[PDB]
Symmetry: D2
Subunit: 114 residues, 4 copies
């Protein structure tokens, strides 16, 4: 099934933050309304943040996360969780190798902000 | 119901990160086996990542998140989600007022690391 | 924080299913647009399905789950999770006693159907 | 990533319930420690419960859900959610066609019981 794609409310601000846990340099692309809106790049084997930014969900609200290492796409796992019918988390895990810990690049999208 | 309490696998390293979205200064305490192991604080209405740290769950694996503003405990909401039976996220939201956005202090705990 | 309240897309069919795990008789009331649409009453310590129906979220899309035992409201815990940005589950747990297992009456709402 | 596989606590009773939403007859196989423990077969386009039962996770605690239609394995999506650090839901969606509603066979596993 498709992973890393989330429908957020339209024209709404959201936070996107990426953490790295791999020997490989992670490249996290965030697409909004089918256009690259942000790109984070970094390396860490200790969960360091490699990027955090506030973006706008665009006209459709479609937000997609893609992760690659040196141009090679990582396999993704994702889900959205809503607490007290109002607080949203769009979560993404990614695997750049074969140990399947899926934490090589961990991406957290949260809204609302402010 | 109790919120902000999570049982992690024993003696496991995990990351804990806090975000702020409020006019009030947030203070986040992370307890391991009932004793504070990390504290973050900051003031942002733009999702600033006010703190992050790597901790060890210890023999009990018990982790609890508490959020306060000016010495007043915020109301918490939380849940744990596991992706592909391996990637874990312990999520916490908090409300320091009455506008019910529950994002005043958002905390994300993730494991495994590395 | 408020629990057991979910905002579903309007005029959408959804399933609601209740399970019982307690010595006490569980009364599960499902409100759609603030009006009772279904009620299940049963006792089991072995997860019997005390009720399962298909309801329409109506014009409001507001769905609320209430659980009581002999007229006394149970404390609720809830969350919504979305898989592959399309499959939705609204989850509810409830506690009627002191052991805090929150499974005394478990309710699962799922959509879309068909 | 692999989907439909969950690690439950050892020797623990859990509930498994399957719903159908497809023109095709769904065959849901529930494996415990890599051995078939239960099978639900049925057809419905109205979320009918095609099976509900109580199983034991055994020593390994390994539980896997497989879904097929006409012998063809459906594509699965899954996640585990834990509320108030006590109530567990292992959720599975499956797609037997191309409309990607992933509700063709919906499986809900919950524990603890009692
Ligand atoms: C150190 C190793 O680097 C990799 O690329 C990762 O796939 C492994 O999970 C691990 O983090
Ligand atoms: C600016 C406001 O600050 C308050 O303290 C928060 O409770 C509100 O949600 C909002 O962030
Ligand atoms: C048998 C007991 O019944 C009580 O009413 C419940 O609160 C307990 O969790 C347990 O199920
Ligand atoms: C009636 C249709 O049956 C197909 O086989 C399913 O894939 C569709 O989602 C739909 O339920
Ligand atoms: Ca890896
Ligand atoms: Ca890794
Ligand atoms: Ca607030
Ligand atoms: Ca706020
Ligand atoms: Ca109880
Ligand atoms: Ca119980
Ligand atoms: Ca389908
Ligand atoms: Ca279907």
């Amino acid at each position: 099934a498709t992973q890393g794609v989330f429908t957020l409310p339209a024209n709404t601000r959201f936070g996107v933050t990426a953490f790295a846990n791999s020997s490989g340099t992670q490249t996290v692309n965030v697409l909004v309304n089918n256009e690259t809106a942000a790109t984070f790049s970094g390396q860490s084997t200790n969960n360091a943040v490699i990027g955090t930014q506030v973006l706008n969900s665009g006209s459709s609200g479609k937000v997609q996360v893609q992760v690659s290492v040196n141009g090679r796409p990582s396999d993704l796992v994702s889900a959205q969780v809503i607490l007290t019918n109002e607080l949203n988390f769009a979560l993404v895990g990614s695997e750049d190798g074969t140990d399947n810990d899926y934490n090589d690049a961990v991406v957290v999208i949260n809204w609302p902000l402010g």
